[PDB]
């Protein structure tokens, strides 16, 4: 997951 600003759970 490349998004560091959202919890991917």
């Amino acid at each position, epitope marked *: 997951n*490349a998004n560091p*600003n959202v*919890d991917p759970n």
Partner: antibody
Amino acid sequence: EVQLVESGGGLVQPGRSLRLSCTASGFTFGDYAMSWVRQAPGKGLEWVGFIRSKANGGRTENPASVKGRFTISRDDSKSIAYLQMNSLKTEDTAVYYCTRVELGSSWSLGYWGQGTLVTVSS
Amino acid sequence: EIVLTQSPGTLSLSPGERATLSCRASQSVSSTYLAWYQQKPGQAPRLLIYGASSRATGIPDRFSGSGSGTDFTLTISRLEPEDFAVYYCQQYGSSPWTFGQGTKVEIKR
């Protein structure tokens, strides 16, 4: 004003381990994701991982070049991000920068420390 | 991984001239996930431009960016002496985050 100071670098023999520290001040450290970027001498920039904020799970991501060898953690009570570097190889010789990941939908690397040099050699 | 290819490798210009730097992505990437950085020898990189229209705080007006999909451009409308340095593009929309190989802006003679 944002300040990021890297420490823990220096000379280390191949196969040994190092832990880098990045001490942050001037902003709410716990609100931001943090990221490490390295630059081998004479070469370009390579991302080596980020860690999310506690509000976003606090988990990490890193590329395959360092996966299983490097681990990022953070201490929000001390405003410090860490880079645990295990199984070091000569190819890991680089200047290591800690960066603050910007908020919002466009998470660029808004602030960079001066960097700390890590030299892997026997 | 998305490969970022910058061109030209070195652009040779005089102070006061216009600089046009290119960054081509091997796969389509939205403009929201693209950034440009400046680095001078012996110093850390600094953020210049990110996203569609975002400019980093304290960055002068002469730096601008455009493009979408696979083709992106960084424009320095009027080169100042401190603008001669290495410029990197970066994408962070896909894992892993990747940087271009860098474009050097040198003094022409």
